[model samples]
Target: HGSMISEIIKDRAKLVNEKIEELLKEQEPEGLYRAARHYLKAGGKRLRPVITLLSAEALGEDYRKAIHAAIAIETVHNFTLVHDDIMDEDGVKTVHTLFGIPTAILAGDTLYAEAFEILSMSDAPPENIVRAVSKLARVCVEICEGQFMDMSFEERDSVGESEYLEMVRKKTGVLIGISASIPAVLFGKDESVEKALWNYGIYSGIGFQIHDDLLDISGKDWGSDILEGKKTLIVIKAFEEGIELETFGKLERDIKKLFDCGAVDYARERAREYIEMAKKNLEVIDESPSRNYLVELADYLIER
Candidate 1:
């Protein structure tokens, strides 16, 4: 039932799950620990840690050696999700939904602090540890900045493509970018390797966010972003193309107008371009299952 990508994900996902569980073994008080472990227990694809491990593996390093780094990456990713859920006041079954906002907020803070601690204790060299921490800190700031930009966009009528691209890169791409490339930093590989993987992350990360916007327009959540008045790429493009106000008032009509004017096609084309760029960045590495998978994974950014 699974193809190569799924097979790799299936095998690697188990290892990542085990490593995450081991690192999170210590429990806080009753509800705090439960809240902290809430989303982890519910489960996710664990894609970020898989990329971290694969990034190390592509360099001929034992993936297990970078387990701590992978854990740290996943920890930070989940921390962001917890806070995002709170900020969005999402009632669609989140940690906050289970244990209330205050506990959820504390749990998120704990994960954010614990990520650096996990990285500091990883088996990587001390110099690499410092670099990883620094990278994580910078990305944390960028994420906040991106979130602010996103919120601010809601109050505006239009946003340019370049500005939107930068926002996605900062908000969504930096974490994956670091995860994809930090293996070089951990193993003390050449700077070129780090650069190549970082480029891959940036390209693919942008594609990922674009696809998410597409999903909001085309998936079951159709017109949800429109109703929220979020300045998504599709929304901006449709407006720029001079879509009618009447279309905006009707979800079905708005979607059809967006499709008819090629706004949807424009976003899809851009996503493919970024995915191609991501693949190009991986050419610097020798071919291996890990490397090949990374290339294929980039394609999946837009394919899904």
Candidate 2:
């Protein structure tokens, strides 16, 4: 299942990446374009745009018809990343890290403008294009709200699980939701189909963010989240379970206790549940390779 979905994602990602490159091609004033393309050149999974194309295919429409929409989705996503890196003051090798904060901010702004410009110029029908641009604009507002909520959370010692989940939905889920549902809007699918695609993206996106939190601890940057005092699911659960922090130096051991106390298991199960729900949302679509791939992709979320 993983291999099949990976193959499909790989193929589609190549196409999406090419389109992004062309859309982001340099004009003049090498520095501005260079800053803009910094993260673009570094490359990512291109998951949002890939899902957009797959959403079109699942709707029985030519995926090519939504290519510009896909590019717009990715561009806006990159814009968020650039701004996010600056806001986070992250030392990760990003545009803000290499270039000055001012330049990085400009690059992000450029991408933000270009996203709307590209969407306006897409080959989609005029009505569909207008709808797409409007939806994307609304999503951008949601993302900003989510980011502010995340920052606010840092000031609080604890937040309710439901509140955190909603934060995750806004912070990460909406973009993925837009990626899937925008194709339905473009293809003029029925309302039910549109709702299903949106639900799928929402569920998968929540699961994806949970998995990222897990990776923050278990991956090579293990304990970094702990060092930063991030209130991820595991941390929240640990606090609820009465785990006490002795000192910053004991974070490694405290993280181990978090796993030992089943906090990790609890978070993993929650993520898995959402992924399952996401897969269920696909039942509204016809049984096709694209639909099947989306199911497998949901499964891949937990596995990832």
Candidate 3:
């Protein structure tokens, strides 16, 4: 199911890389070029932009025109990552530290600015470009709001379940929705399809993130988030459930025990429950290849 998604990413990433290079050359004097290039080349999953391209292509829109849109999404994505890595102070070496935070921050700013520049160069109708840009801007704000809420949540012992969902939906899910919804708009599908795709993206994004929390606690990556004290779905879920909290508390009774116990496995099992819920929520588009691919993608992320 995910084969097509993989192929789409593989094929278009080359084109996207070329576009980034071209943009870099055109804006070299601006100073963000090298930093932007470094971030893209550092090799994270190129999933979001690929989803945007595939959604537009699957719905019969000109996929190439979505290039700039994809670029814009990527620009915002990297910008967040740089700032997030910094604020998290997680100490993963980045191209940013090489040049310094001030340089990296300004570089991120330039990429954000260039997203519009790339959009201006696109051949798509002004209306479509405007629509695409509107979604991008809205999503950017949503993410910022989510981050703000998340920061607030960190100081509390437990955050409201609804508030957690809201933060995840705004911060991460909207961008995924932007991936699908922007293309649906370009395709001129019924406004209904846009909403459906948004549902799929956001719900799946939440589920995917929840699953990541499971992995961090159990798998090789398990302790990173804990070490950083980033509140996550699993931790939140534990907080809200008396039984789970007791179990988690017992696990945390000793630092060595917490680190060595099967806490990760416990979290993974809980995440699977949410993954099933995510699958059920995707029933609306069950017959579509994209939907199936999305399910497969979710499984890929969630499965041990």
Candidate 4:
């Protein structure tokens, strides 16, 4: 029942998890490592590192060649969420809330620095590692711009659809591209292969974020985005139609207004389109079990 794909991801994730245990073990400044590892130990789907593993295997390279790089990308992904926790919270144990903002900043910076350190240790050729490191460094900058815009949207009077998409593309989207394509660069594959995998992940990642927005509205995130005033695409569409929440806030009540405005449905359809395009990008890869997993993974971005 709907468990196969997730199981595949689990197996892939375990490989990365074992490596993280070996390489990321705690050392001096115990608090920093504890704060840094808190969420990672709590757990994640480990999708980014799994994607790196599959991308390399699909490209006909041994997964070990990319394992360190896989962990590196996962480290980058973790640092984003580390700082992200500095800005947001959970019911309990958000790093900043528990560790204090200053130490949490140390945690995130340490994680960020470790990405380059782990990447430099990748078993790939020196040239390949250099290219991968450069790509990751620039990707971090793209994420910053998106986060800046995401925070600034709260003060702005209006946000358009494309503007919202661009924000997502930078914030939570571009990082996935590297997970799916870093192997191509590591293997020195043709530019066409690299670009196709990049597009595969880029489009899929956009759909993944939009679906995340939908997930919040569907009662998963307690509708916190609305409370935070982040200007999601659904909010943009609702505003265009002059809809207003009854109270401007679990939003179980205000969600009716969004449903009436068709904003939720619009976001759902847009998410679907992005995944379809992402699936199209996979045809460029040769037929293989791992590549098929990627197609299935692309569809899961919207499906779940």
Task: Please list the C-alpha lDDT of all candidates, in the order they appear.
Answer: 0.84, 0.87, 0.66, 0.85
Q: Write the per-residue lDDT of candidate 3 for residues 98-144, one digit (tens) a residue.
A: 66777677777877777767756656767777777787888888888
lDDT of 1 by residue, 246-280 (tens): 54332676678888989898888888899899889
- lDDT, ranked from best to worst: 2, 4, 1, 3
Residue 15, candidate 4: Cα error in Å is: 0.9
Worst ten in a row by lDDT for model 4: 244-253
Provide the clash count, candidate 3. 2
The residue ranges of model 3 lying beyond 4 angstroms of the native Cα positions read: 1-8, 219-221, 242-291
What tens digits encode model 4's per-residue C-alpha lDDT throughout 1-304?
3347777898999999999988788878899999988777887788888988988988989988899889988898888888987765543468898889998889999989998999899888899889999998988899989888887776787888898889888887788888998999888998889898888888888999888888876713677788866677888899988997654432677788888888999999999899888878888999888888888887777787
Error of 1 at 276 (Å): 0.7
Best by TM-score: 2
Residues 1-304 of candidate 2: C-alpha lDDT, one tens digit per residue: 4478888989999999888877889867788789898888888899999999999999999998888889899999999999999888862388888888998999999999999998787777788888888999999999999989998888898787888899999899999999999998877677899889989999999999888899877725667778777778888888888886654432566778888999998999999999999989899999998998888888887787
TM-scores of all models?
0.94, 0.95, 0.80, 0.94
Question: Candidate 1: what lDDT?
Answer: 0.84
The candidate with the higher lDDT, 1 or 2, is 2
Q: In candidate 1, where is summed lDDT lowest over 10 consecutive residues?
A: 244-253
Q: Name the regions of candidate 1 deviating beyond 4 angstroms.
A: 1-3, 244-250
Error of 2 at 35 (Å): 0.9
